[PDB]
A paper describes a structure:
ADARs (adenosine deaminases that act on RNA) catalyze adenosine deamination within duplex RNA yielding inosine. For instance, the nearest neighbor nucleotide preferences for ADARs show a strong bias against reaction at adenosines with a guanosine 5′ to the target adenosine (5′-GA sites).
Therefore, we prepared a 32 bp duplex bearing azaN adjacent to a 5′ G paired with 3-deaza dA for X-ray crystallography with ADAR2-R2D E488Q. The overall structure of the asymmetric homodimeric protein bound to RNA is very similar to the structure described above (rmsd of 0.201 Å for 698 equivalent α-carbons) with well-resolved electron density for the purine:purine pair adjacent to the azaN. The G on the 5′ side of the azaN is in a syn conformation with its Hoogsteen face directed toward the Watson–Crick face of the 3-deaza dA on the opposing strand. The position of the substrate strand is shifted slightly from that of the structure described above such that, in this structure, the base pair hydrogen bonding involves 3-deaza dA N1 to G N7 (2.8 Å) and 3-deaza dA 6-amino to G O6 (3.0 Å). Interestingly, the shift in substrate RNA strand position observed in this Gsyn:AH+anti structure allows it to adopt a phosphodiester backbone conformation that is nearly identical to that seen in complexes with RNA bearing ADARs’ preferred 5′ nearest neighbor (5′ U paired with A).
Numbering used by the authors:
A (entry chain B): 235 to 463, 476 to 700
B (entry chain A): 316 to 699
Amino acid sequence: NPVMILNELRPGLKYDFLSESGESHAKSFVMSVVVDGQFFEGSGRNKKLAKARAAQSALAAIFNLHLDQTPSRQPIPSEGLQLHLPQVLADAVSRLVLGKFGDLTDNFSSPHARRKVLAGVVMTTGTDVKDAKVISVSTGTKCINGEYMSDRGLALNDCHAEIISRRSLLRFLYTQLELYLNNKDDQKRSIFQKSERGGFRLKENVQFHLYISTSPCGDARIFSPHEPIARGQLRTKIESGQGTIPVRSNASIQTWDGVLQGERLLTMSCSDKIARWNVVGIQGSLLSIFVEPIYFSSIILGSLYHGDHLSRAMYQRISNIEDLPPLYTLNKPLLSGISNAEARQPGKAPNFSVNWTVGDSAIEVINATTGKDELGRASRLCKHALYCRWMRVHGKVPSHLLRSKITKPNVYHESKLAAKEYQAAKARLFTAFIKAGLGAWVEKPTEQDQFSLT
Amino acid sequence: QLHLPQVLADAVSRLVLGKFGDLTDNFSSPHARRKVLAGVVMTTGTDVKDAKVISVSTGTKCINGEYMSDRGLALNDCHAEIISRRSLLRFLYTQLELYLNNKDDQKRSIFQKSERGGFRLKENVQFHLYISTSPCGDARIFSPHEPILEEPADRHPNRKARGQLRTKIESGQGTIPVRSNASIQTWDGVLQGERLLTMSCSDKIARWNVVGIQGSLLSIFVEPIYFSSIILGSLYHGDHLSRAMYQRISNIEDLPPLYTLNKPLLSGISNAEARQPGKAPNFSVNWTVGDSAIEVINATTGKDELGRASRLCKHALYCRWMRVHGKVPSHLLRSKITKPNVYHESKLAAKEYQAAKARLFTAFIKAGLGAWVEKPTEQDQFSL
RNA sequence: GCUCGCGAUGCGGAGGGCUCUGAUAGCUACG
RNA sequence: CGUAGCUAUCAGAGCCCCCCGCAUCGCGAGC
Ligand SMILES: O=P(O)(O)O[C@H]1[C@H](OP(=O)(O)O)[C@@H](OP(=O)(O)O)[C@H](OP(=O)(O)O)[C@@H](OP(=O)(O)O)[C@H]1OP(=O)(O)O
Ligand SMILES: O=P(O)(O)O[C@H]1[C@H](OP(=O)(O)O)[C@@H](OP(=O)(O)O)[C@H](OP(=O)(O)O)[C@@H](OP(=O)(O)O)[C@H]1OP(=O)(O)O
Ligand SMILES: [Zn+2]
Ligand SMILES: [Zn+2]
């Protein structure tokens, strides 16, 4: 018992409360300890849990790691063990994302800070870990409704936190390309190099890490957290409520007029989309025409971390993937929990999704049910807006520099199809899933990406 | 040693309370502390002397959503009357093993071979459910207080509210109607904070008044069993209880053979019980005839205080069922539907029970009372 | 007879904080 | 042999705080 051992180890220790926050089950107190001259702390929804984790941090830093809680143990990246000890990275990136969220909501006071799932992307450039940078912050645990889907690329289909965070990572990527391409002076400050095999690659040792307040829905979350001692089915988000249900191994594929007479919109679960990302990259098809594949190095969970189930959800379940195009791969990033994981607040989901990318001055708020911002407009994150960025980047890069031949681009879907190797990796991923007994990916009716900018 | 409805009601209440006392060291144990007491009493004839207490339980809480077990090791619902049914199930399994041991032991079993296939109760074996208060939901919600000759009947029998399916909600108070087009529960949704929903006891007892008290699995061995009486020790309201237990689903149709809409005797007792003072215990006790001692389960976790599975949990019941299954000759099964050994699938092998359950769900829907709210399917996807 | 909105008085499982009592456990102090 | 105290847990009676459909009455409107 942590404080008991800490006060039978250096028995004169006095604990300092700093700042209480929240209401009902969403409340947290911060507790601190001074022992052997080092300022420690933990977090917890009641005092005697925050103090317990503060004591655990003290004894970890001085003496030793406590109960080698066995599913609480982190897989490690195949390549890039560069940002030092996995727990120290995990705790750093969760703290960074929580701090940026605080800044973005009047120090957790704005009405938009009441959220169920927080998420974020954090960038490192160095083996040194003190030089991180929060790239994007998002919330949301909800999805557009059948009657609200856009044919003009003007509505966010998925507003779950992880997903919104990735779209903000795409906004950051377009900004970085435009930065490299606006001045020979600014090329030194872009995250991108000219690449030897063509187009752009990331400057060496630039890596991105993904934080989610909880485990992604679907497969990484199908376990009992109080008995950790197994069939990675593709699952789809149920419209209406939070949570997912497994893909039906035989049922008809969606079409645009069918989501308005008999059925709702079937969106893939966040586990599946992250697994997807671990093969095709986090940059999607359109960016791939300009840059070499980008993969996350870390998936840090602020709760419901379980090493086996997350391993399965994120890469192991599709180990059977074959013949990936060049530079694609089965990314096996670092997976970790955090120390003072947050608590389960049993309540109804918020209805808004918050997003912010580094560069912007303020968060943007989206009704996840209509995929529009709460006075009825298109998000900076939506299909149409990203495509607008992409068109502006295409206009500045010579026809030689492209990673794919695409000339005179008009329609979204066709510009996506121009990304031949990425579509190849997409097909390989789909087949891996089918052949593993895990169901077939549900794709949207291709009419909703059938739109020009005009 | 006679019959009269009020005589019977008082007799079963005395027996359950007395047996509870015997089990709790004359109510001096820390575990005697209870808000709600429930039990099952078995009769075999007209002599009140012949009544036998089968199970006793307490509890007023249900499992915390974070503690759901995907291996069937946790009790989901510790309201006393639900626990009392599960304890009776243990008894039913024991009685089948008694029948199967040998021809001499067979005489003592409450089961006999059935002419329709499988087994059925011997003539005049009856079970009676006792609850120290009105079951939550439809029977309880519109008057959660003791009745007085002065207060009228329900001044509003025709409100939409009357008869609706309702759920307990985790961290919520009261029970709630199912919403118009209420969306299905998911394992990952509950884990992330969607509040776990459980059907109210009023709704569960009505279900048992259609599909029987034995559950699906036992129905693979035995014909449907019904309560002959429901005895409340306090907060009796005749019109609400009668509506809740059956009258609300008098529109049910097309039940499979041997199923019926059972309308048991409903009664209060002559000397109504009192409110018990005290913060309500977070634990639940259970006992079945033949057990040496009570079992104490933390209702919020669904396991005992050392984290062990209850003798009443799904996994334990699946084990009892599997042992009997290996002993019953195929020609004696009531169903010959082969299904893979996963709790969910074995239940599906009880085809007629599933049909009766379907008629029940439909009765509620067509009556305007809402749709039954089931657990995430992942709950039952485990094997021994 | 209901249904909906607003108001009013009440009724019926969570989280958190401050006290009072009992039990265990570990560590001090003093005679 | 004691008393005193300090933490860590449990167990139990209090005081707040804060959440999360139903009853009774009134007003408006509708079926
Ligand atoms: O961030 P998400 O909400 O998960 O969006 C993705 C993304 O679409 P956009 O970038 O156009 O929004 C995928 O696009 P690419 O990765 O190919 O660039 C697209 O897949 P396809 O365009 O390859 O079909 C997929 O749609 P889906 O998998 O249903 O076809 C869609 O996810 P949602 O449709 O669920 O928003
Ligand atoms: O009396 P309870 O403790 O509430 O248990 C019942 C029982 O399940 P178990 O016997 O496995 O504990 C029902 O099973 P049947 O005997 O009726 O077949 C099951 O209904 P299903 O038939 O769908 O399994 C129902 O679960 P659900 O509420 O999802 O219908 C579940 O109730 P709880 O989940 O409330 O314990
Ligand atoms: Zn999700
Ligand atoms: Zn109940």
